Amino acid sequence: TAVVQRVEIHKLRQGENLILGFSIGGGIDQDPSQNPFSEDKTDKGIYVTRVSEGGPAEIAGLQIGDKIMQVNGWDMTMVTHDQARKRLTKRSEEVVRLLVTRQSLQKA
Amino acid sequence: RRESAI
Ligand SMILES: [Cl-]
Ligand SMILES: [Cl-]
Ligand SMILES: [Zn+2]
């Protein structure tokens, strides 16, 4: 089935911006049916839709299709898009410790 | 579907 893993990403300080190098989709305030990475099309959780090449997230292990369970202690399963966006962009945290799950593959 | 680049 699906395996659970944790990814720790050190943000990239570009001038005055902090970059993680990935994109998200999902959230309770969004239509879960438009999600190709979730087995259950009702799942409105947060998912990684993009991972920039040579970015912090890619180097850290983040993979497209990964579902973000929690970020630095905060839960990410029952939040809105903006909420997840804010919890990943808190300027006071140079690092984000992600708890994610991904189709384990290796499941022939 | 909305999408945020971070
Ligand atoms: Cl990937
Ligand atoms: Cl954590
Ligand atoms: Zn760092």
Give CA–CA dist A64/A90, Å, rounded. 22
**In 10 A of CB A49, how many CB atoms?**
20
Tokens of A46: 């947060």
Strands annotated E in A11-94 = 12-14, 17-19, 22-26, 46-51, 67-71, 74-75
Number of domains in chain A: 1
Here the CATH number for the domain that contains residue A92 is: 2.30.42.10
How close, in Å, is residue B5 to chain A by CA atoms? Answer: 4
Tell me, in Å, the resolution of the deposited structure: 2.8
Burial (CB < 10 A; 0-12, 13-18, 19+), residue A101, is middle
Domain that holds residue A91: 1-108
Listed residue (A32, A34, A62) closest to A50, CA to CA: A62
Partners of residue B3 in chain A, C-beta under 8 Å: 23-25, 49-50
CA dihedral (A92, A95, A97, A100) positive or negative: positive
- Rama region for A15: left / alpha / beta (φ>0; ψ in -120 to 50; rest): left
CA atoms lying within 13 Å on the CB side of residue A58 = 9
A10 contact B CB<8A: no
Contact B3 A23 (CB under 8 A): yes
Q: What determination technique applies here?
A: X-ray
**Distance, CA of B4 to CA of A84 (rounded, Å):** 10
